[PDB]
Amino acid sequence: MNIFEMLRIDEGLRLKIYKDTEGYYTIGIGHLLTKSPSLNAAKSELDKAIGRNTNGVITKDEAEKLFNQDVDAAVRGILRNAKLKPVYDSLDAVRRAAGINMVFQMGVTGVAGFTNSLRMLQQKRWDEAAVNLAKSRWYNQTPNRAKRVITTFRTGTWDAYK
Ligand SMILES: [Cl-]
Ligand SMILES: [Cl-]
């Protein structure tokens, strides 16, 4: 198990544009295209990301390429953030993956204002972090996935993923 399989499990794989849990146009492995409600705007974003006139459908390879880029970007957002980085560097590999997942899902901004959680993780107070992270919209909106992520942080193992 690793970050890629992990997210492949949480996000699934779809080759035609679809709406994510928030109702935003997405494609591939959780690749967000746009927050706007216009299908054509999404199609425009897609073509631009792929480099060709796609008509809203892409290939597996193409999905995989976006994915790669996206993981990469998430790590990099982490490393460039002053609040996150320190936390990240303090963690073990398995938990790092948990942190990436979250950033992938909600953005830097997103995970960066979980200050208290951050503090607790930095301290390696896992059970406590786990309760704090659950007091969130995130958890209430996507409970099965948040649970997986939180037990990851809590246990440092991949048991939630099998
Ligand atoms: Cl892109
Ligand atoms: Cl969920």
Curated annotation (Swiss-Prot):
Cross-referenced Pfam families: Phage_lysozyme
EC number: 3.2.1.17
Main location: host cell
Outcome of swapping residue 11 to Q: Complete loss of activity
Catalytic activity, reaction form: Hydrolysis of (1->4)-beta-linkages between N-acetylmuramic acid and N-acetyl-D-glucosamine residues in a peptidoglycan and between N-acetyl-D-glucosamine residues in chitodextrins
Expression induction: Expressed late in the viral replication.
Any GO BP annotation: cell wall macromolecule catabolic process
Keyword Hydrolase: yes
Example GO molecular function: lysozyme activity
Listed GO CC annotations: host cell cytoplasm
Statement: the UniProt record of this protein carries the keyword Secreted: no
Reported effect, residue 30 to F: Almost complete loss of enzymatic activity. The enzyme is destabilized by 1.5 kcal/mol
Similarity comment text for this entry: Belongs to the glycosyl hydrolase 24 family.
Role: Endolysin with lysozyme activity that degrades host peptidoglycans and participates with the holin and spanin proteins in the sequential events which lead to the programmed host cell lysis releasing the mature viral particles. Once the holin has permeabilized the host cell membrane, the endolysin can reach the periplasm and break down the peptidoglycan layer.
Protein name in the entry: Endolysin
GN (gene name): E
